[PDB]
Design an enzyme around this catalytic site. Structure first.
Site, PDB file in Angstrom:
ATOM      1  N   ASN A 232      -1.004   4.006   4.065  1.00 29.93           N
ATOM      2  CA  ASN A 232      -1.168   4.480   2.773  1.00 29.93           C
ATOM      3  C   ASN A 232      -1.321   5.886   2.411  1.00 29.93           C
TER       4      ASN A 232
ATOM      5  N   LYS B 109     -22.670   1.551  29.533  1.00 31.62           N
ATOM      6  CA  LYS B 109     -23.873   0.249  28.252  1.00 31.62           C
ATOM      7  C   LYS B 109     -24.773   1.257  27.818  1.00 31.62           C
TER       8      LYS B 109
ATOM      9  N   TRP C 130     -30.306   9.756  22.105  1.00 27.90           N
ATOM     10  CA  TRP C 130     -28.796  10.008  23.086  1.00 27.90           C
ATOM     11  C   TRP C 130     -27.756   8.931  22.078  1.00 27.90           C
TER      12      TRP C 130
ATOM     13  N   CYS D 284      -4.304  -7.584   5.088  1.00 30.08           N
ATOM     14  CA  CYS D 284      -5.749  -7.307   5.483  1.00 30.08           C
ATOM     15  C   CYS D 284      -6.622  -8.678   5.779  1.00 30.08           C
TER      16      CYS D 284
ATOM     17  N   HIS E 262      -1.329  -5.143  -2.786  1.00 33.22           N
ATOM     18  CA  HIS E 262      -1.637  -6.428  -1.810  1.00 33.22           C
ATOM     19  C   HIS E 262      -2.206  -6.060  -0.653  1.00 33.22           C
TER      20      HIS E 262
ATOM     21  N   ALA F 257       0.940  -1.429   0.167  1.00 29.04           N
ATOM     22  CA  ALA F 257      -0.094  -0.359   0.152  1.00 29.04           C
ATOM     23  C   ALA F 257       0.842   1.414  -0.189  1.00 29.04           C
ATOM     24  N   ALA F 258       1.653   1.727   1.224  1.00 30.18           N
ATOM     25  CA  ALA F 258       2.405   2.634   1.107  1.00 30.18           C
ATOM     26  C   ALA F 258       3.562   3.092  -0.133  1.00 30.18           C
TER      27      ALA F 258
ATOM     28  N   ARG G 228      -0.400   4.068 -15.706  1.00 27.15           N
ATOM     29  CA  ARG G 228       0.399   4.852 -14.745  1.00 27.15           C
ATOM     30  C   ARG G 228       1.775   5.662 -15.132  1.00 27.15           C
TER      31      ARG G 228
HETATM   32  C1  FAD Z   1      -2.944 -10.442   9.114  1.00 27.71           C
HETATM   33  C2  FAD Z   1      -3.303  -9.082   9.476  1.00 27.71           C
HETATM   34  C3  FAD Z   1      -3.958  -8.421   9.100  1.00 27.71           C
HETATM   35  C4  FAD Z   1      -4.315  -6.693   9.316  1.00 27.71           C
HETATM   36  N1  FAD Z   1      -4.999  -6.117   9.274  1.00 27.71           N
HETATM   37  C5  FAD Z   1      -5.905  -5.254   9.126  1.00 27.71           C
HETATM   38  C6  FAD Z   1      -6.332  -4.286   9.429  1.00 27.71           C
HETATM   39  O1  FAD Z   1      -8.080  -5.157   9.569  1.00 27.71           O
HETATM   40  N2  FAD Z   1      -6.584  -2.808   9.037  1.00 27.71           N
HETATM   41  C7  FAD Z   1      -5.673  -2.375   9.388  1.00 27.71           C
HETATM   42  O2  FAD Z   1      -5.562  -1.105   9.477  1.00 27.71           O
HETATM   43  N3  FAD Z   1      -4.105  -2.784   9.383  1.00 27.71           N
HETATM   44  C8  FAD Z   1      -4.611  -4.130   9.174  1.00 27.71           C
HETATM   45  N4  FAD Z   1      -3.116  -4.726   8.688  1.00 27.71           N
HETATM   46  C9  FAD Z   1      -1.863  -4.121   8.454  1.00 27.71           C
HETATM   47  C10 FAD Z   1      -1.631  -3.723   7.320  1.00 27.71           C
HETATM   48  O3  FAD Z   1      -1.818  -4.854   6.270  1.00 27.71           O
HETATM   49  C11 FAD Z   1      -0.622  -2.663   7.070  1.00 27.71           C
HETATM   50  O4  FAD Z   1       0.068  -2.113   7.572  1.00 27.71           O
HETATM   51  C12 FAD Z   1      -0.279  -2.333   5.773  1.00 27.71           C
HETATM   52  O5  FAD Z   1      -0.103  -3.311   4.334  1.00 27.71           O
HETATM   53  C13 FAD Z   1       1.395  -1.852   5.010  1.00 27.71           C
HETATM   54  O6  FAD Z   1       1.956  -1.424   3.826  1.00 27.71           O
HETATM   55  P1  FAD Z   1       3.375  -1.643   3.453  1.00 27.71           P
HETATM   56  O7  FAD Z   1       3.205  -1.848   2.181  1.00 27.71           O
HETATM   57  O8  FAD Z   1       3.671  -0.776   4.578  1.00 27.71           O
HETATM   58  O9  FAD Z   1       3.618  -2.973   3.951  1.00 27.71           O
HETATM   59  P2  FAD Z   1       3.407  -4.467   3.792  1.00 27.71           P
HETATM   60  O10 FAD Z   1       1.887  -4.235   2.497  1.00 27.71           O
HETATM   61  O11 FAD Z   1       3.846  -5.640   4.084  1.00 27.71           O
HETATM   62  O12 FAD Z   1       4.076  -3.971   2.220  1.00 27.71           O
HETATM   63  C14 FAD Z   1       5.682  -4.353   1.598  1.00 27.71           C
HETATM   64  C15 FAD Z   1       5.933  -5.277   1.083  1.00 27.71           C
HETATM   65  O13 FAD Z   1       7.507  -5.087   0.839  1.00 27.71           O
HETATM   66  C16 FAD Z   1       8.095  -5.975  -0.128  1.00 27.71           C
HETATM   67  N5  FAD Z   1       9.680  -6.088   0.554  1.00 27.71           N
HETATM   68  C17 FAD Z   1      10.053  -6.497   1.747  1.00 27.71           C
HETATM   69  N6  FAD Z   1      10.911  -6.820   1.871  1.00 27.71           N
HETATM   70  C18 FAD Z   1      11.663  -6.465   0.095  1.00 27.71           C
HETATM   71  C19 FAD Z   1      13.135  -6.254   0.049  1.00 27.71           C
HETATM   72  N7  FAD Z   1      14.127  -6.678   0.255  1.00 27.71           N
HETATM   73  N8  FAD Z   1      13.027  -6.241  -1.519  1.00 27.71           N
HETATM   74  C20 FAD Z   1      11.088  -5.901  -2.649  1.00 27.71           C
HETATM   75  N9  FAD Z   1      10.498  -5.614  -1.657  1.00 27.71           N
HETATM   76  C21 FAD Z   1      10.883  -5.779   0.007  1.00 27.71           C
HETATM   77  C22 FAD Z   1       7.065  -7.101   0.295  1.00 27.71           C
HETATM   78  O14 FAD Z   1       7.038  -8.557   0.244  1.00 27.71           O
HETATM   79  C23 FAD Z   1       5.968  -6.170   0.702  1.00 27.71           C
HETATM   80  O15 FAD Z   1       5.415  -6.618   0.236  1.00 27.71           O
HETATM   81  C24 FAD Z   1      -3.045  -6.447   8.728  1.00 27.71           C
HETATM   82  C25 FAD Z   1      -1.847  -7.197   8.802  1.00 27.71           C
HETATM   83  C26 FAD Z   1      -2.003  -8.482   8.810  1.00 27.71           C
HETATM   84  C27 FAD Z   1      -1.004  -9.292   8.391  1.00 27.71           C
HETATM   85  C1  COA Z   2     -34.951  11.406  29.466  1.00 29.60           C
HETATM   86  C2  COA Z   2     -35.187  12.697  29.292  1.00 29.60           C
HETATM   87  C3  COA Z   2     -36.430  12.801  29.957  1.00 29.60           C
HETATM   88  C4  COA Z   2     -34.193  13.578  29.572  1.00 29.60           C
HETATM   89  O1  COA Z   2     -34.067  13.411  30.716  1.00 29.60           O
HETATM   90  P1  COA Z   2     -31.616  13.316  31.099  1.00 29.60           P
HETATM   91  O2  COA Z   2     -31.732  12.821  33.158  1.00 29.60           O
HETATM   92  O3  COA Z   2     -31.209  14.484  30.623  1.00 29.60           O
HETATM   93  O4  COA Z   2     -31.197  12.076  30.378  1.00 29.60           O
HETATM   94  P2  COA Z   2     -31.339  10.495  31.552  1.00 29.60           P
HETATM   95  O5  COA Z   2     -32.058  10.020  32.032  1.00 29.60           O
HETATM   96  O6  COA Z   2     -30.565   9.496  30.467  1.00 29.60           O
HETATM   97  O7  COA Z   2     -29.466  10.404  32.825  1.00 29.60           O
HETATM   98  C5  COA Z   2     -30.162  10.720  33.772  1.00 29.60           C
HETATM   99  C6  COA Z   2     -28.434  10.221  34.515  1.00 29.60           C
HETATM  100  O8  COA Z   2     -28.292   9.092  34.009  1.00 29.60           O
HETATM  101  C7  COA Z   2     -27.489   9.683  33.531  1.00 29.60           C
HETATM  102  N1  COA Z   2     -26.618   8.154  32.277  1.00 29.60           N
HETATM  103  C8  COA Z   2     -27.817   7.808  31.341  1.00 29.60           C
HETATM  104  N2  COA Z   2     -27.703   6.848  30.301  1.00 29.60           N
HETATM  105  C9  COA Z   2     -26.734   6.033  30.953  1.00 29.60           C
HETATM  106  C10 COA Z   2     -25.819   5.394  30.411  1.00 29.60           C
HETATM  107  N3  COA Z   2     -26.354   4.206  29.643  1.00 29.60           N
HETATM  108  N4  COA Z   2     -25.017   4.514  31.534  1.00 29.60           N
HETATM  109  C11 COA Z   2     -24.723   5.087  32.691  1.00 29.60           C
HETATM  110  N5  COA Z   2     -25.421   6.529  33.076  1.00 29.60           N
HETATM  111  C12 COA Z   2     -25.877   7.142  32.253  1.00 29.60           C
HETATM  112  C13 COA Z   2     -26.619  10.309  32.780  1.00 29.60           C
HETATM  113  O9  COA Z   2     -25.183  11.101  32.967  1.00 29.60           O
HETATM  114  C14 COA Z   2     -27.868  11.477  33.855  1.00 29.60           C
HETATM  115  O10 COA Z   2     -27.004  11.858  35.177  1.00 29.60           O
HETATM  116  P3  COA Z   2     -27.077  13.438  35.928  1.00 29.60           P
HETATM  117  O11 COA Z   2     -28.651  13.262  35.752  1.00 29.60           O
HETATM  118  O12 COA Z   2     -26.594  13.603  36.653  1.00 29.60           O
HETATM  119  O13 COA Z   2     -26.742  13.938  34.064  1.00 29.60           O
HETATM  120  C15 COA Z   2     -35.797  12.873  27.855  1.00 29.60           C
HETATM  121  O14 COA Z   2     -34.585  13.167  26.874  1.00 29.60           O
HETATM  122  C16 COA Z   2     -37.073  12.465  26.942  1.00 29.60           C
HETATM  123  O15 COA Z   2     -37.822  12.402  27.128  1.00 29.60           O
HETATM  124  N6  COA Z   2     -36.174  11.999  25.706  1.00 29.60           N
HETATM  125  C17 COA Z   2     -37.594  10.710  26.092  1.00 29.60           C
HETATM  126  C18 COA Z   2     -38.221  11.702  24.770  1.00 29.60           C
HETATM  127  C19 COA Z   2     -37.586  11.474  23.230  1.00 29.60           C
HETATM  128  O16 COA Z   2     -36.363  11.937  23.409  1.00 29.60           O
HETATM  129  N7  COA Z   2     -37.939  11.436  21.859  1.00 29.60           N
HETATM  130  C20 COA Z   2     -37.266  11.292  21.541  1.00 29.60           C
HETATM  131  C21 COA Z   2     -38.143  12.503  20.498  1.00 29.60           C
HETATM  132  S1  COA Z   2     -39.256  11.833  18.947  1.00 29.60           S
END
Ligand code: FAD
Ligand code: COA
Ligand code: FAD
Ligand code: COA
Lengths: 442, 443
Positions: B301, B357, B429, B44, B41, B12-13, B71
């Site tokens: 990237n 929650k 909210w 990911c 490639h 990518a880089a 390109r």
């Molecule tokens: C299993 C896995 C899952 C991942 N999932 C995520 C994700 O979900 N989200 C996310 O943001 N990132 C994810 N990553 C990380 C992401 O793939 C990398 O950060 C990104 O590809 C980095 O790009 P890059 O070009 O720097 O490295 P690379 O994509 O690895 O490219 C480096 C390339 O240089 C080549 N190279 C190495 N040495 C030489 C050399 N001596 N001469 C010529 N070429 C060489 C290699 O063959 C390689 O193809 C994942 C990585 C892995 C391994």
């Molecule tokens: C609920 C309502 C009465 C507002 O009351 P509110 O007290 O300001 O909001 P909450 O009852 O959720 O908050 C009570 C307390 O619990 C806390 N709290 C709310 N949800 C929480 C969460 N899931 N986890 C931990 N704390 C929470 C808040 O910080 C609040 O603390 P505080 O009184 O010290 O500020 C109002 O928004 C309402 O009438 N809602 C229903 C109608 C509506 O909004 N319909 C949409 C328009 S169609």
């Protein structure tokens, strides 16, 4: 001195304001007046209650006694605030008066009512509050429905549409112009939701609804364009903040239509606050005052309002316009300025629209994801990101953090985002997007 | 003029660097020498090709035809760099040796597995999982010989990923872990404990064991440790990896305290015109500023990209790394960014932590799985030092947190960030926001 706090509305914003104040000040008298049976409820669940994916009690977070006995909040259910003036509230068995030292408009936004014939017919529904969810299911029981029409091409409408296709119905969406979600998203993102939408839904673009027919039951819907058989109607034509009690005290109303607030969520009137869907807020990028009726901000606004009342200064930085929805397989989402918005604001912009994969070319289950980015040509800062397809949450949420902070295209590129084959491709779509845009420097 | 650029390594880089240079300077001579047959490639994908979940040809991003024809890279496959001196590189390709002049040199030759001092490491049946030739060799062995029992010497990520590859194929797998717990080097106990529960149920997990010897006929049949014996027909050695620095040393290249090639922001080495990218290179840590070695793909990237740009006269700086990484065993997701509690304490921080929650969905919408979060916080500044996430749907929490840490967010900064909500995505909210709140902004 102990002090009396009064909160109008027992939704997300209201209870967040209520909890916070009592939490910080246990000796204070905290009253909440909610008009319905419902408290700590979720309007977001309705579509899924109606779909039937779950039940309507699960639109509550906490039950009443958790607030009253376990949190010491004087919760008045079935209580409608009908009047307000300085220091006084008027509520309705019984019609009583209360005094306040502090007031919170945690008042929400009701759906917009388009004045056409048949709007009031048994059979027509608007989805806003939890009682609406039970009423629709109580209806589908008393009557037999197979044809459903939906007026509105927004998100509320799409979620409701899906809630019926899953129940196996003949669904028809009627949007008033060229595309779905045209107000919030750009065409090249909206197109991809539509490919899937057209197919599972009778999508009727460029149409205006004229009338709704029936007896006492709804039976048909007529539009400028054509007729459609319908036995149940959902109206999602937008919403507007409940501002009627606010005016009652000449509280400033924002350019936006919602109640003007500051960082502390304070209004133009002393000791009077506002939070949630009634409240106009600030945009993090633009600095413009903006209206974004969404849940996370609603709660945070309530939290912020509660804190300042209890005498510990806290600022709400504002909102990014971050939102997310879904039609079946398709996830749609944005954060920050759309291309259209960025243009309206007078930015000099460049854009990019890319497709990528959701997984590496080896590990299976790889699906499609599209991303549009908007950038300011002068600063290189991101103005907004839109994402569509599969697995878009990490992208949108991540970009939201980056925007909050004012990341550049280059800042995003070198941000250490995670990679493993079951999670994402080597080059994460977000960092791909950010590379396609380029980093220009005079 | 028309310079000669030589890159040791075709991963990518190396390919990122070669592409970058040629892209900025098309009139230049750019050569890549790769020891194996694989270019561009993905090591990911070795665990997933071994599992049979993917074909080997799937490990290559581009065929070598693209780099050469499309390109312009003078790619030399099956060519090994043997010696390096200022101005020259000795390569072995067609059975013989040859010499090449360089004006710029890049070390992208990666890291190879640590060879352990156990007796019987060279039997047949014992494999390292590092480069693509390994993955073929593993399949070809399972094809030629009957394998029932598999022993992994490991503990860390590759080990677990190799362990999983064999389990879902029905095999009998045993893991040998030196000392107390799995992944002990990169995660805190309360995080790995959750994976370990899932591991033991599908693995013969053997902790606190030093593998003494690998025994067998002409080929492996048993693994002996100071704990006991284990029947084994195939062994995976995955006890850690080491950077290939032996040919850097010939050039007089400074090697960092980590063991990898020392670099700076530009990916330059101690030697003039000499660069290093990927698993060979030591880089900076974004939080501590300390020199660190993190052999991971997205960094490798970017390091290649950055090295290429600087060679071609377009100045660019690699800011460093966060220690961001992610793995999975079965349906258990494990991932971190920034410093763990142990790393932070080792660095002398005044630390507070929180372990919470939560769920991946709201209590109406179904399919809600469990998610646990751990956060480390600096007391003096309120800044996040690191986040560990375990359970389901953890990618949003890590990627978002990574951006926050990259930027230097505080718990309050985190709390007030506009993160997305819809029922099919997350709870109202976000679990990240709850962590930020439970952490607190004490000032
Ligand atoms: C299993 C896995 C899952 C991942 N999932 C995520 C994700 O979900 N989200 C996310 O943001 N990132 C994810 N990553 C990380 C992401 O793939 C990398 O950060 C990104 O590809 C980095 O790009 P890059 O070009 O720097 O490295 P690379 O994509 O690895 O490219 C480096 C390339 O240089 C080549 N190279 C190495 N040495 C030489 C050399 N001596 N001469 C010529 N070429 C060489 C290699 O063959 C390689 O193809 C994942 C990585 C892995 C391994
Ligand atoms: C609920 C309502 C009465 C507002 O009351 P509110 O007290 O300001 O909001 P909450 O009852 O959720 O908050 C009570 C307390 O619990 C806390 N709290 C709310 N949800 C929480 C969460 N899931 N986890 C931990 N704390 C929470 C808040 O910080 C609040 O603390 P505080 O009184 O010290 O500020 C109002 O928004 C309402 O009438 N809602 C229903 C109608 C509506 O909004 N319909 C949409 C328009 S169609
Ligand atoms: C169908 C639907 C789906 C949605 N999906 C999402 C989503 O996926 N993600 C997201 O972030 N947001 C979503 N939203 C928006 C989200 O529900 C709101 O932004 C949030 O609930 C606002 O909370 P609030 O407390 O300010 O207003 P509300 O939740 O509407 O609460 C206001 C309360 O005040 C009461 N009230 C009104 N007038 C009076 C009065 N005069 N006297 C006493 N009480 C009164 C009402 O009965 C109501 O219960 C969705 C909304 C709808 C309608
Ligand atoms: C592929 C590799 C050679 C890098 O090559 P690269 O040229 O730097 O990156 P790309 O191949 O994506 O380049 C494509 C170009 O088209 C652009 N592009 C446009 N749309 C794109 C899209 N939607 N997706 C990807 N690239 C796009 C890129 O920005 C880039 O532009 P540039 O030439 O101006 O810089 C290198 O990463 C590699 O060898 N990878 C294989 C191994 C690996 O990925 N990881 C190893 C462990 S998992």
């Amino acid at each position: 001195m102990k002090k009396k706090v009064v909160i109008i509305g027992g939704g997300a914003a209201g209870m967040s304001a209520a909890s916070r104040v009592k939490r910080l000040k246990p000796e204070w008298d905290v009253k909440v007046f909610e008009a319905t049976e419902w408290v700590s409820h979720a309007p977001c669940g309705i579509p899924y209650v109606v779909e039937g994916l779950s039940t309507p009690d699960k639109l509550m977070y906490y039950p009443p006694e958790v607030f009253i006995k376990k949190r010491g909040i004087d919760l008045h259910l079935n209580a409608e605030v009908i009047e307000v003036d300085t220091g006084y509230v008027r509520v309705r068995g019984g019609e009583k008066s209360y005094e306040w030292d502090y007031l919170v408009f945690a008042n929400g936004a009701s759906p917009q009512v388009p004045a056409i014939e048949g709007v009031n017919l048994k059979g027509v529904f608007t989805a806003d509050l939890p009682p609406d969810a039970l009423a629709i299911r109580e209806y589908m029981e008393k009557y037999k429905v197979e044809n459903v029409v939906i007026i509105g091409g927004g998100y509320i409408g799409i979620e409701m549409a899906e809630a019926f296709a899953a129940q196996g119905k003949n669904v028809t969406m009627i949007v008033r112009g060229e595309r779905v979600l045209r107000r919030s998203f750009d065409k090249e993102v909206t197109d991809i939701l539509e490919e899937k939408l057209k197919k599972h839904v009778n999508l009727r673009l460029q149409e205006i609804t004229m009338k709704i027919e029936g007896e006492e039951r709804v039976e048909k819907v007529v539009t400028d364009a054509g007729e459609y058989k319908a036995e149940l109607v959902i109206l999602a034509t937008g919403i507007k903040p409940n501002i009627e009690l606010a005016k009652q005290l000449g509280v400033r109303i924002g350019e936006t239509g919602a109640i003007w607030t500051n960082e502390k969520m304070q209004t133009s009137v002393e000791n009077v606050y506002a939070a949630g869907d009634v409240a106009e807020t600030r945009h993090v990028i633009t600095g413009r005052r903006v209206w974004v009726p969404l849940a996370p901000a609603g709660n945070k606004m309530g939290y912020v309002a509660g804190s300042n009342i209890a005498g510990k200064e806290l600022h709400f930085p504002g909102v990014l316009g971050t939102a997310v929805t879904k039609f079946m397989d398709v996830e749609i989402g944005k954060t920050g300025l759309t291309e259209m918005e960025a243009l309206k604001e007078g930015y000099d912009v460049r854009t990019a629209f890319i497709k990528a994969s959701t997984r590496p070319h080896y590990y299976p289950g790889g699906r499609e994801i599209w991303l549009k980015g908007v950038v300011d040509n002068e600063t290189n800062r991101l103005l907004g990101v839109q994402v569509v397809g599969s697995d878009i949450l990490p992208r949108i949420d991540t970009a939201a953090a980056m925007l909050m902070a004012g990341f550049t295209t280059k800042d995003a590129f070198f941000t250490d985002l995670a990679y493993a084959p079951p999670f994402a491709p080597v080059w994460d779509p977000l960092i791909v997007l950010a590379r396609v845009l380029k980093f220009l420097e005079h």
